[PDB]
Design a binder for this molecule. Structure first.
Ligand SMILES: [Zn+2]
Ligand SMILES: [Zn+2]
Ligand SMILES: [Zn+2]
Ligand SMILES: [Zn+2]
Lengths: 195, 193, 196, 192
DNA sequence: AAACATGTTTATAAACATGTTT
DNA sequence: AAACATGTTTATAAACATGTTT
């Protein structure tokens, strides 16, 4: 299984989320001390990338899902069959109906599965912020609820975004739990009460 | 052309269907069958004069709401592809309604309407019995995402002639779920408005 | 392959049967004819009647072997549970291997055997014709583990396979019957009868 | 010698035992009802600190005189089972085990053949009034081959580093399948 | 024999978790 | 959001099966 350990690296690589509009019906929200994303299915979710020094030639940013619990870590993460086949979300998407993770607003994006692992992930060429901007925004879409039967089956997962060299070297990586549900607002308020 | 009818029609042979926290339960006041997925479901048929020769009983599911009638009812992709319930089995894996215990049961998909249904040759009751029994199994919960997506359905059981002329028709709403008992009691308290 | 339980009267019209089952409510054993099933308490002796219409061969013998009733289990040797195999109780000064489920009492020539390859256990007795004026040869069998014995039969129904053989193991006839070793044969048998 | 004593003896340190479902304890019948191998929390209480190598021994013994002379052990079935016996420091025969303590030491008297398990005594956590020991019982009271439904007592003894008994408390233990059911049973049974 | 004892199974019912509708 | 809807998981109680005691 792939590594899920925070490694800032040579470019002080960092992933973060802008203000999570706590306005009750927020399409997504992020608990900072739970290191957890609560996101509605398919809704666009913006991620902030910061680097302390410019990364290499054609570096890239990959996002890969994986289960949190040890008993499952071995199993790939993809869209439950019902969602892989249904008409919605698939209309005419340049992504494979299997991949739980999609990127938005970036035609240079490229999806991929590994023959040896059969692990699914999406890659995007790194691109420095625009003038007077501190972050580089990547737009993500999560295609299955974390409770789809025949898929995540209510099994927690976590996103492992990593920065890499044009040819695979791991320049840095960060991770956060991701619960893609219907009421990120409620499911977060509640999780913050279990303690 | 139009969506299959759902109006009760006893017909020349006075054709009628009826039912005898168990596997299922049937509300007569709501004419609605509550039942667990894939569990066996006994339906009693009754005629007052013998149907013709190759007379058959066909069961077809159709959405209840006008908003959905035109869409064929089928199993959700999950279940249609799952090995569970489809291993040793002659029913095409997509058909919602199957009938167990009758080798002559034939499943059919309309070549033009795309609609699916299962027939069973008509056979009078056993001697000293007043009811011919048919055993249905329903293969998807009403709530199956990808399938019924919780849209209610009607079961249209129709007595026909060897060559598909309808001679009788009875209909009932079917709610395949995990807790027929609970849910039925819910619907019953709901009208206790 | 898992030993044959097919009824086969053979050339000598081999047949096993039971005398009065004395119901008594407290019998040490009882036998249902309609269920072909023997009910009997652990270790209590069990008289079984053998009949033949023509004398069997020379070294002709009678072997009794337990085997599981259900296909799902038929491949597992039937033996005593560890508890009873290790216990001093019943193994006191017996000539019989402590692991063997079926024993025979009142016969010095009785001989226990484990198949080197199959590892199956059985007990044989040299067949002897009945005493003068008696129609049946009698064989006293003992069953050393209840059925519900944990780590042993663990409530898995068995069948006993009594067989008539030639001195050299050729089967001359074979009969079978289920065998439920319990504490209240009277109750359990009535139970099975109401059940139907 | 004679069979191990079972009379409560608080002793110089006011040694006492108590209990705060997988288990339940009847105070009127001084009896513990609990499921097999499941974890059992027992609360030790003293009023002054015991000596140095002070230990807490737990030893099981038959309740009835008809059986006291017999050592209480696991039935051959469980003793030989892979179940509960895989990675274990406790001998597979020992009925009582202690979980959550690497210092726990199992002993079998060379002469009496009796088996128990000791745990070094350590005072409660700061702000806590009780030292807690976690015990596991590896056979059902009913195990054929073993207890064979014969009732047993648990003799928890506070001892000197060299085994001189300093304190002693006892309680009957019934390891069964439904502690709730059985306790209610005995309870209704005496209410008669 | 009748009543009890005691580990397993079966049945019922709440409590959960989480998506949709009012 | 507040309420509901609807499959799962947990908790409880009965019912069983079967050996012992009275
Ligand atoms: Zn999905
Ligand atoms: Zn389905
Ligand atoms: Zn045994
Ligand atoms: Zn045991």
């Amino acid at each position: 299984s792939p590594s899920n350990t925070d490694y800032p690296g040579p470019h002080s690589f960092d992933v973060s989320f802008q203000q999570s509009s706590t306005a009750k019906s927020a399409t997504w929200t992020y608990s900072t001390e739970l290191k957890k994303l609560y996101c509605q299915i398919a809704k666009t979710c913006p991620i902030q990338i910061k680097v302390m020094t410019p990364p290499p030639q054609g570096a890239v940013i990959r996002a890969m899902p994986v289960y949190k619990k040890a008993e499952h870590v071995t199993e790939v993460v993809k869209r439950c069959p019902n969602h892989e086949l249904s008409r919605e979300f698939n209309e005419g998407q340049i992504a494979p109906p299997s991949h739980l993770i999609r990127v938005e607003g970036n035609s240079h994006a490229q999806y991929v599965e590994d023959p040896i692992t059969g692990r699914q992930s999406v890659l995007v060429p790194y691109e420095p912020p625009q003038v007077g901007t501190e972050f580089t925004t990547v737009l993500y879409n999560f295609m299955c609820n974390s409770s789809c039967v025949g898929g995540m089956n209510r099994r927690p997962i976590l996103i492992i975004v990593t920065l890499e060299t044009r040819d695979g070297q791991v320049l840095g990586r960060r991770c956060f739990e991701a619960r893609i549900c219907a009421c990120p607002g409620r499911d977060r308020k509640a999780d913050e009460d279990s303690i």
